[PDB]
Design a protein around this ligand. Structure first.
Ligand code: RBF
Ligand code: RBF
Ligand code: RBF
Ligand code: RBF
Ligand code: RBF
Ligand code: RBF
Ligand code: RBF
Ligand code: RBF
Ligand code: RBF
Ligand code: RBF
Ligand code: RBF
Ligand code: RBF
Ligand code: CL
Ligand code: CL
Ligand code: CL
Ligand code: CL
Ligand code: MG
Ligand code: MG
Ligand code: MG
Ligand code: MG
Ligand code: MG
Ligand code: MG
Ligand code: MG
Ligand code: MG
Ligand code: MG
Ligand code: MG
Ligand code: MG
Ligand code: MG
Ligand code: MG
Ligand code: MG
Ligand code: MG
Ligand code: MG
Ligand code: MG
Ligand code: MG
Ligand code: MG
Ligand code: MG
Ligand code: MG
Ligand code: MG
Ligand code: MG
Ligand code: MG
Ligand code: NA
Ligand code: NA
Ligand code: NA
Ligand code: NA
Lengths: 64, 64, 64, 64, 64, 64, 64, 64, 64, 64, 64, 64
């Protein structure tokens, strides 16, 4: 059985790096992280000093 | 990093109050609840005494 | 077996009341109305005296 | 010909009132506003004192 | 309030049995599992000895 | 001209058998049933003794 | 209250004429037909002598 | 950079002519109109003397 | 078994004729073309002398 | 690089067996078939002696 | 009230840089640009010397 | 007439480079490659030494 958690990563550099940010967090806390699916991308502009790229991913991990 | 939990709130009054019901529950258990996105709405009719409005939300919270 | 009918309710007050308007009509004519799923919402503005909220629902009823 | 503008209204009270907030703004600036279609709903939680309901609408107006 | 978890069940027999595999896991760990909604189906072919059917479900459970 | 009715079939055995349950009902009441399209699948768990698979279909029939 | 019926019209000439074919049928049988929304288009090729254009519409009519 | 405007064209003749009606309007007011994408089609029936076909398009134009 | 190919037909006349253009091409090269499903429509404007209607279809053909 | 082909399998028994029918065909003709994603399911009723279940899959295979 | 404009940015380098190109244009002409949502990505290949990445964004700005 | 092939490119560097990987393959084998549309993005994590970014594209090429 796989389970997915819905995470939004952020980066001041790129959408790829924002996806990595989410996956990094998942790997900090979860065992057996196997894949991620991108479900949304966006950019935070008018509440931050530097534009912040965001990539939202379903991160899948194998249970047990 | 943000994480989302997929919650269905209920209310005998309105779709807005049903969204609040879910958000209330998220705030009981989670720190740093930041926003919610409505993903579905519905009404339970033939198993309840009063119609029950339901609003399903992705509730986003900031990790750490 | 459940069957759904696709109804648009209207209200001069709210999207919740517009959903109720559709469900009310379904219950006038159908037995065993069990639930409704919201599939669209809108507002009629420039053909009415008062703005009219509309909520379109699939209203499910149990056959037999 | 109709044209649509994509507006997000806000309210501290309800999703209906948030839709009205967008439509109100459209009517301030545009002639011949005819209808609105709801395309998203959400709630701002962790940057505001009171939860703020948001309803995003395509607001249609007749050209000429 | 209902909460949903996004689980992918697997089976070497059928899509139905794969849905059951996910639901079985949810019932092992959660109280008050009430329904599941199928959100994706697929088949693993070229990393397994036998084709493996997969059914991804949102499994809903009642909180409290 | 074809018309479609939106039916949810149920089965304690499989998603295929649940689709058949809906189609069976359509054929009881309608002439010239020609095809069905699956539009949703789900499982009822916590209100039934045995898990109940559900398959929702648009069932198309030829008018006249 | 509006209700919609899901009809597929056909024509050997065009997608517009196929939409009209469905609407024509709705007007034969229903009072107060108000609008139609196109939801699918297709072409039947290898079971007919002439290609047959099909347009599927939700046809809305006002109840009462 | 391209920008899109969301326009609904109308015609008493066809969906193609309705798309042209929107594009015609865009070309009256905008420079560098490059393409259009159809996003919806419909038919106005019970407020007009003749059925009116509607085609909604995103009309893209090049900025600068 | 059916297979589909994803083709975009073009026409200076209509969306119907653009669908036919794709189907014509499929029939030139494939045996047992059975149906087509429209998946997108658009108009090329600012790289052509005459507006060019486009209809993208999945064209289904029976294998063997 | 992976490539996908869009195949509809058929079976007089089940949606699972219909998916297998498509995958079987892909494996007859292609090397390195790795997975399939279900994209549609349906049932042929009024042109066949026995109901025929259909499962449409994107079948992915590794190039080279 | 927020309003969104639908812009396609381009870059010969990356999808991130293409999103920035659109946002840059929005900030040239609009006050109070707050966020962007990615709605499509693509690549222009056979009309340009170098591949051109494109990212289409809804760019949101606060009115007043 | 344009035809599209559905390709998934991979890269250990970025989603942009993964799109290029698919397009590169298309250009190796096909004449008149004109554009690509991104339809999915993902990351392979727990079967590879380095995370592998994937971008799935419909790659369009002009026939004849
Ligand atoms: C992808 C994305 C979507 C957003 N959507 C909204 C929104 O719908 N409403 C909102 O108030 N702020 C939204 N924001 C945040 C906004 O830019 C700003 O930080 C808030 O307005 C602060 O209250 C969004 C930010 C991002 C990156
Ligand atoms: C939005 C919504 C969707 C529902 N969908 C289903 C369904 O697909 N099948 C079902 O058995 N009950 C469904 N129900 C519950 C139904 O109204 C009733 O309580 C059940 O039939 C009890 O078994 C739904 C209820 C709501 C509020
Ligand atoms: C949600 C909604 C969508 C509508 N869409 C359309 C449309 O696409 N075309 C149209 O002519 N009128 C539309 N109308 C009706 C419009 O406001 C007006 O009453 C008509 O233009 C009368 O011919 C719509 C009304 C609502 C509430
Ligand atoms: C519907 C909605 C969606 C939002 N989405 C995002 C988002 O994707 N990323 C984000 O940083 N903030 C988002 N926000 C704003 C968030 O709540 C907070 O104000 C920001 O994090 C401030 O930077 C959203 C707010 C709303 C109401
Ligand atoms: C429904 C489904 C979707 C899949 N999608 C992908 C994918 O997008 N990329 C991938 O590398 N592997 C995918 N795989 C796994 C693939 O079959 C194989 O196990 C991997 O390529 C191993 O690295 C998928 C498997 C299934 C069952
Ligand atoms: C596919 C499916 C979806 C359902 N969705 C809901 C729902 O959204 N809300 C709800 O109260 N019950 C729902 N139910 C019914 C639920 O399992 C239980 O019978 C009800 O909670 C009884 O009130 C659903 C059942 C099925 C099979
Ligand atoms: C838009 C459209 C979709 C169709 N889809 C299917 C299908 O999924 N399976 C099928 O057997 N026939 C389908 N047909 C019918 C097909 O062309 C042929 O008449 C049947 O194969 C006869 O059994 C479709 C026809 C049209 C016009
Ligand atoms: C595509 C389309 C969609 C429409 N949707 C609606 C609607 O949702 N509600 C409505 O009141 N009128 C709608 N109308 C207008 C309707 O036919 C009639 O003109 C209005 O009811 C006048 O108030 C629509 C018209 C078209 C062409
Ligand atoms: C339906 C449709 C969609 C198009 N989308 C794009 C696009 O996203 N980007 C683009 O550069 N050109 C696009 N074009 C082509 C555009 O009109 C023009 O020919 C190109 O800009 C040439 O580089 C599109 C054309 C059509 C018909
Ligand atoms: C999933 C599915 C979808 C279909 N859709 C259509 C359709 O849209 N139009 C049609 O004429 N036949 C359709 N058919 C075929 C239909 O049942 C019958 O064989 C044809 O009407 C023969 O011309 C479909 C069959 C299946 C299995
Ligand atoms: C994302 C994207 C989508 C496009 N879609 C189309 C299309 O549907 N039809 C078309 O003629 N050109 C399209 N083009 C443009 C195409 O590559 C080429 O420039 C045109 O064919 C010039 O007429 C597209 C370009 C891009 C980047
Ligand atoms: C975007 C993406 C989606 C995937 N989906 C699945 C899946 O649904 N099931 C699966 O078994 N593996 C999937 N995989 C592959 C998975 O990470 C691992 O390689 C396989 O589990 C090997 O059997 C996917 C990989 C990617 C990159
Ligand atoms: Cl989710
Ligand atoms: Cl329907
Ligand atoms: Cl495809
Ligand atoms: Cl838009
Ligand atoms: Mg930096
Ligand atoms: Mg988002
Ligand atoms: Mg009360
Ligand atoms: Mg739901
Ligand atoms: Mg009042
Ligand atoms: Mg509507
Ligand atoms: Mg207040
Ligand atoms: Mg939104
Ligand atoms: Mg076995
Ligand atoms: Mg999946
Ligand atoms: Mg049994
Ligand atoms: Mg359902
Ligand atoms: Mg003729
Ligand atoms: Mg169809
Ligand atoms: Mg005329
Ligand atoms: Mg519309
Ligand atoms: Mg001509
Ligand atoms: Mg397209
Ligand atoms: Mg048999
Ligand atoms: Mg299909
Ligand atoms: Mg360069
Ligand atoms: Mg695009
Ligand atoms: Mg490297
Ligand atoms: Mg994918
Ligand atoms: Na989730
Ligand atoms: Na219906
Ligand atoms: Na817009
Ligand atoms: Na394809």
């Amino acid at each position: 059985v796989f389970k997915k958690v819905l995470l939004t990563g952020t980066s001041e550099e790129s959408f790829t790096a924002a996806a990595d940010d989410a996956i990094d967090r998942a790997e900090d806390t979860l065992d057996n992280v196997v894949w991620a699916e991108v479900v949304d991308q966006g950019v935070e502009i008018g509440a931050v000093e530097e534009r912040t790229y965001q990539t939202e991913v379903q991160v899948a991990f194998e249970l047990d």
